[PDB]
Each structure stands twice: as structure tokens, then as C-alpha cells.
Design an enzyme around this catalytic site. Structure first.
Site, PDB file in Angstrom:
ATOM      1  N   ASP A 171     -16.417  36.542  14.515  1.00 12.03           N
ATOM      2  CA  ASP A 171     -15.703  35.933  15.652  1.00 12.03           C
ATOM      3  C   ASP A 171     -14.333  35.521  15.141  1.00 12.03           C
ATOM      4  O   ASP A 171     -14.208  34.508  14.404  1.00 12.03           O
ATOM      5  CB  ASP A 171     -16.475  34.679  16.137  1.00 12.03           C
ATOM      6  CG  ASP A 171     -15.815  34.041  17.375  1.00 12.03           C
ATOM      7  OD1 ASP A 171     -14.693  34.511  17.751  1.00 12.03           O
ATOM      8  OD2 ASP A 171     -16.416  33.115  17.968  1.00 12.03           O
ATOM      9  N   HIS A 202     -17.773  36.642  19.192  1.00 18.45           N
ATOM     10  CA  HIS A 202     -18.183  35.727  20.282  1.00 18.45           C
ATOM     11  C   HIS A 202     -18.845  36.553  21.370  1.00 18.45           C
ATOM     12  O   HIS A 202     -18.748  37.794  21.367  1.00 18.45           O
ATOM     13  CB  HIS A 202     -16.972  35.000  20.889  1.00 18.45           C
ATOM     14  CG  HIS A 202     -15.931  35.915  21.418  1.00 18.45           C
ATOM     15  ND1 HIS A 202     -16.022  36.486  22.678  1.00 18.45           N
ATOM     16  CD2 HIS A 202     -14.835  36.458  20.824  1.00 18.45           C
ATOM     17  CE1 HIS A 202     -15.029  37.353  22.834  1.00 18.45           C
ATOM     18  NE2 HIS A 202     -14.291  37.354  21.728  1.00 18.45           N
TER      19      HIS A 202
END
Length: 233
Positions: A171, A202
Site C-alpha cells: 500500500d 489498499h
């Protein structure tokens, strides 16, 4: 989408709607779901459905009601993602925490409630789950890939109830130094649990994301359910 007629009042009188899922069998703990940056949309409805299938009730508040009530954006439409980013940029985090407190209060007193309330958030909601945990409004909190947690480390000792966080290792909202700051800081409070998913970024738990990873979504989801299970009476 929201449940017609549900209106919850916040601390300053602002009112907002919510998507509500009653449980298969009552009494049951109620889970307040804190949205991503797309409003109360398809993924929120799917999350309500999942938690009801797992024996909970669920309440997903319209957190963008202070800006545009009833916003529900398709994360696969570019124009809607653009509107989602503009809403996120203008979002008042402190007022969001207050709206969540009002939804958690609403959750505790529903006719089908066993009196225990949990919160699960994703994205904007994951950052909100940490702020709610520092406030102590819920029995247990869960955050998926919350953004900017490295900037809230001074709130770590305020956490007095269990809170679980799922963070993606790929992420890019959380580069290497931010991961180290969060791992070291959260690690000073055993009420905080954080897991890293090496091959995921994410939105890894949302099937519609280009970042969806089935293995990471399944391991995080079972951890979330094992973590919420003590709330069942």
C-alpha cells in the site's frame, strides 16, 4: 443506498441516514460500518450482508451527509472516483468521529441489540476506526487499510478497548518509514493488534478493486470475525 426513514442525530444537530441490516436472530451485537471514500455503496451493502450472515446486526451511517446526503459512488466509474476524491479532501475527520459516536449510540439501543457494539471501517473508515478506538466509544474496533495512521501515533496510549488493523505491505499510502513508525508505535499498547499483508495494497478486501487479493481478504476477514465473536452473547 440507505434504509428509508432511518435518521440519526449527531452532537451539533446535523442529521444523517444509514443502511441498516437487522440480525437473523435477536438479540445480537451491532456493528457500525465506517465507509470508504465512496459513500454508502455496493461494497457497504455487501459488508452489511456479510456481517448479518455471520450473526450480527449492522448499521452503516451516511458520513458524507454533511456535504452531499445519499452519495453512493461506483469506484469503477472515473467521474465518480473524481467526485469521491473531492469529498474525501473536504471531509471533516473530527465531525466524522462525532457522527460515528452518534451511530454507535443508536446501535446500542436498537430493539434487537444485545448491548455490545463493534465498529469496522475501510479506508477513510479505517482511519476513523483508530480515532474512535482512542475515544473509547466501542467495545471493539477494526480498521482495514486506514490512511495516515502514522500521523496519529500520539493517540496510541488513549486506546482502552481492543482495536485490530489490517495493513497492506504494497500500500503506497504507507511507505517503508511509515510502516516502521506504525509497527513500533502500535506495539506499545497490547490492546492494539496490527497485521501486515505483504502482497496486498489498499482496498484488498473489495472484489471490485484492481487491488483485490483473495488470500489477503480471506485471512483478514476471518481475523476480523474471530476478533468480533466475543461480542456475541
Amino acid at each position: 443506498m440507505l434504509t428509508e426513514g432511518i435518521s440519526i442525530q449527531s452532537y451539533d444537530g446535523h442529521t444523517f441516514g444509514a443502511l441498516v441490516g437487522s440480525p437473523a436472530k435477536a438479540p445480537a451485537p451491532v456493528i457500525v460500518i465506517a465507509q470508504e471514500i465512496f459513500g454508502v455503496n455496493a461494497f457497504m451493502r455487501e459488508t452489511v450482508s456479510w456481517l448479518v450472515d455471520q450473526g450480527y446486526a449492522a448499521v452503516c451511517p451516511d458520513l458524507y451527509a454533511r456535504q452531499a446526503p445519499g452519495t453512493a459512488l461506483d469506484p469503477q466509474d472515473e467521474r465518480q472516483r473524481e467526485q469521491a476524491y473531492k469529498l474525501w479532501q473536504a471531509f471533516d475527520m473530527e465531525a466524522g468521529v462525532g457522527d460515528l459516536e452518534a451511530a454507535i449510540r443508536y446501535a446500542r439501543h436498537q430493539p434487537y441489540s444485545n448491548g455490545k457494539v463493534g465498529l469496522v471501517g475501510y479506508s477513510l473508515g479505517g482511519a476513523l476506526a483508530f480515532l474512535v478506538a482512542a475515544k473509547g466509544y466501542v467495545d471493539r474496533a477494526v480498521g482495514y487499510y486506514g490512511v495516515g495512521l502514522e500521523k496519529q501515533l500520539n493517540k496510541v496510549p488513549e486506546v482502552k478497548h481492543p482495536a485490530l488493523f489490517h495493513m497492506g505491505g504494497q500500500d503506497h499510502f504507507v511507505p517503508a518509514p511509515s510502516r516502521q513508525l506504525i509497527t513500533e508505535g502500535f506495539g506499545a499498547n497490547p490492546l492494539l493488534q496490527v497485521h501486515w499483508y505483504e502482497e496486498a495494497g489498499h482496498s484488498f478486501a473489495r472484489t471490485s478493486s484492481s487491488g483485490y487479493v483473495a488470500s489477503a481478504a480471506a485471512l483478514a476477514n476471518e481475523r476480523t470475525l474471530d476478533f468480533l465473536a466475543p461480542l456475541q452473547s
